[PDB]
Design a protein around this motif. Sequence first.
Motif, PDB file in Angstrom:
ATOM      1  N   UNK A   1     -64.248  59.376 -53.046  1.00  0.00           N
ATOM      2  CA  UNK A   1     -64.410  57.921 -53.165  1.00  0.00           C
ATOM      3  C   UNK A   1     -63.086  57.164 -53.142  1.00  0.00           C
ATOM      4  N   UNK A   2     -61.979  57.888 -53.037  1.00  0.00           N
ATOM      5  CA  UNK A   2     -60.667  57.241 -53.040  1.00  0.00           C
ATOM      6  C   UNK A   2     -59.751  57.816 -51.936  1.00  0.00           C
ATOM      7  N   UNK A   3     -58.869  56.983 -51.327  1.00  0.00           N
ATOM      8  CA  UNK A   3     -57.983  57.454 -50.245  1.00  0.00           C
ATOM      9  C   UNK A   3     -57.093  58.662 -50.561  1.00  0.00           C
ATOM     10  N   UNK A   4     -56.699  58.836 -51.825  1.00  0.00           N
ATOM     11  CA  UNK A   4     -55.967  60.036 -52.244  1.00  0.00           C
ATOM     12  C   UNK A   4     -56.595  60.635 -53.490  1.00  0.00           C
ATOM     13  N   UNK A   5     -56.262  61.898 -53.737  1.00  0.00           N
ATOM     14  CA  UNK A   5     -56.654  62.610 -54.928  1.00  0.00           C
ATOM     15  C   UNK A   5     -55.390  63.206 -55.525  1.00  0.00           C
ATOM     16  N   UNK A   6     -55.031  62.748 -56.721  1.00  0.00           N
ATOM     17  CA  UNK A   6     -53.758  63.120 -57.319  1.00  0.00           C
ATOM     18  C   UNK A   6     -53.863  64.289 -58.297  1.00  0.00           C
ATOM     19  N   UNK A   7     -54.921  65.099 -58.166  1.00  0.00           N
ATOM     20  CA  UNK A   7     -55.086  66.338 -58.935  1.00  0.00           C
ATOM     21  C   UNK A   7     -54.103  67.436 -58.544  1.00  0.00           C
ATOM     22  N   UNK A   8     -53.572  67.345 -57.327  1.00  0.00           N
ATOM     23  CA  UNK A   8     -52.421  68.134 -56.892  1.00  0.00           C
ATOM     24  C   UNK A   8     -51.431  67.125 -56.305  1.00  0.00           C
ATOM     25  N   UNK A   9     -50.247  67.032 -56.899  1.00  0.00           N
ATOM     26  CA  UNK A   9     -49.280  66.018 -56.498  1.00  0.00           C
ATOM     27  C   UNK A   9     -47.869  66.589 -56.495  1.00  0.00           C
ATOM     28  N   UNK A  10     -47.173  66.445 -55.372  1.00  0.00           N
ATOM     29  CA  UNK A  10     -45.752  66.824 -55.317  1.00  0.00           C
ATOM     30  C   UNK A  10     -44.865  65.626 -55.565  1.00  0.00           C
ATOM     31  N   UNK A  11     -43.979  65.737 -56.555  1.00  0.00           N
ATOM     32  CA  UNK A  11     -43.069  64.653 -56.905  1.00  0.00           C
ATOM     33  C   UNK A  11     -41.613  65.151 -56.832  1.00  0.00           C
ATOM     34  N   UNK A  12     -40.839  64.555 -55.937  1.00  0.00           N
ATOM     35  CA  UNK A  12     -39.435  64.893 -55.803  1.00  0.00           C
ATOM     36  C   UNK A  12     -38.725  64.397 -57.052  1.00  0.00           C
ATOM     37  N   UNK A  13     -37.693  65.138 -57.477  1.00  0.00           N
ATOM     38  CA  UNK A  13     -36.902  64.789 -58.659  1.00  0.00           C
ATOM     39  C   UNK A  13     -36.404  63.352 -58.658  1.00  0.00           C
ATOM     40  N   UNK A  14     -36.140  62.793 -57.474  1.00  0.00           N
ATOM     41  CA  UNK A  14     -35.639  61.423 -57.345  1.00  0.00           C
ATOM     42  C   UNK A  14     -36.718  60.343 -57.535  1.00  0.00           C
ATOM     43  N   UNK A  15     -37.930  60.765 -57.888  1.00  0.00           N
ATOM     44  CA  UNK A  15     -39.054  59.858 -58.066  1.00  0.00           C
ATOM     45  C   UNK A  15     -39.444  59.887 -59.530  1.00  0.00           C
ATOM     46  N   UNK A  16     -38.624  60.581 -60.313  1.00  0.00           N
ATOM     47  CA  UNK A  16     -38.812  60.700 -61.754  1.00  0.00           C
ATOM     48  C   UNK A  16     -38.938  59.371 -62.462  1.00  0.00           C
ATOM     49  N   UNK A  17     -38.042  58.451 -62.106  1.00  0.00           N
ATOM     50  CA  UNK A  17     -38.006  57.117 -62.684  1.00  0.00           C
ATOM     51  C   UNK A  17     -39.200  56.259 -62.260  1.00  0.00           C
ATOM     52  N   UNK A  18     -39.743  56.547 -61.075  1.00  0.00           N
ATOM     53  CA  UNK A  18     -40.963  55.914 -60.587  1.00  0.00           C
ATOM     54  C   UNK A  18     -42.110  56.363 -61.493  1.00  0.00           C
ATOM     55  N   UNK A  19     -42.208  57.670 -61.712  1.00  0.00           N
ATOM     56  CA  UNK A  19     -43.213  58.213 -62.601  1.00  0.00           C
ATOM     57  C   UNK A  19     -43.160  57.595 -64.017  1.00  0.00           C
ATOM     58  N   UNK A  20     -41.948  57.291 -64.491  1.00  0.00           N
ATOM     59  CA  UNK A  20     -41.748  56.594 -65.769  1.00  0.00           C
ATOM     60  C   UNK A  20     -42.376  55.209 -65.731  1.00  0.00           C
ATOM     61  N   UNK A  21     -42.258  54.532 -64.596  1.00  0.00           N
ATOM     62  CA  UNK A  21     -42.918  53.235 -64.425  1.00  0.00           C
ATOM     63  C   UNK A  21     -44.439  53.386 -64.383  1.00  0.00           C
ATOM     64  N   UNK A  22     -44.942  54.419 -63.697  1.00  0.00           N
ATOM     65  CA  UNK A  22     -46.391  54.684 -63.640  1.00  0.00           C
ATOM     66  C   UNK A  22     -46.955  54.869 -65.050  1.00  0.00           C
ATOM     67  N   UNK A  23     -46.272  55.651 -65.877  1.00  0.00           N
ATOM     68  CA  UNK A  23     -46.630  55.835 -67.276  1.00  0.00           C
ATOM     69  C   UNK A  23     -46.599  54.504 -68.066  1.00  0.00           C
ATOM     70  N   UNK A  24     -45.563  53.693 -67.857  1.00  0.00           N
ATOM     71  CA  UNK A  24     -45.438  52.412 -68.554  1.00  0.00           C
ATOM     72  C   UNK A  24     -46.536  51.424 -68.185  1.00  0.00           C
TER      73      UNK A  24
END
Length: 207
Positions: A113-136
């Motif tokens: 039902x959604x364009x992506x499924x984030x149950x398996x997700x690759x995150x490059x180390x340089x996107x760490x701070x992005x992930x911090x924003x996602x959490x916030x």
Amino acid sequence: TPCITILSGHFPKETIYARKTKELVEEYCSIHGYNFYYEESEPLETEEHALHFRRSWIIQQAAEKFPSTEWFLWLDSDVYVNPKNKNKPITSFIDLSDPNILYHTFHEAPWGSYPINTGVKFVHKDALEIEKIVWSLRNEAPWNTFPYEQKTVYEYVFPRIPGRYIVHDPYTLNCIVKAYPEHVKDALFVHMCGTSRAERDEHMEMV
Ligand SMILES: O=c1ccn([C@@H]2O[C@H](COP(=O)(O)OP(=O)(O)O)[C@@H](O)[C@H]2O)c(=O)[nH]1
Ligand SMILES: [Mn+2]
């Protein structure tokens, strides 16, 4: 061949199927020399939306334990390693060589039902701070609505990082059991997505 840290976590801990996927993942990491991070801390926020966002917080725990990591790989607690492919590396299924790319993600058409499924997700180390924003963002509308972190990556994150993400076919790396039953046998990562705790327990008994 990059440094990979696979991370996961599940509240509540003693859930049977979560213990069973964890061990298959831990075994997988030991075969290939991947780091394995599993969240042991009980969460301050136990509401569904918060538990679904928790991966954006656990990646930071993983980051602090494994500072040398190039790629962090989130696997949902209902994702396991297909025992038939447990001796095959992730790099046999995906090309992680483009240095411009921050996220490798997967679609779930035409069945999901959604364009992506984030149950398996690759995150490059340089996107760490992005992930911090996602959490916030976990308590803000609309991102605190279903489907939560998955919506936040697709609708908040991706528009802000044009050309720095890839959406792949899910057939080997995010193989939803009910949607692609014919691919399950040649998948590396199999996802028991959108099923109950008892249904997932029973399935893991069979594996
Ligand atoms: O009762 C729950 C349900 C969600 N999760 C967390 O949120 C993620 C997504 O949950 P689930 O796989 O059930 O979502 P689905 O794939 O079914 O949409 C899991 O990996 C867990 O870390 C959790 O801790 N407890
Ligand atoms: Mn899942």
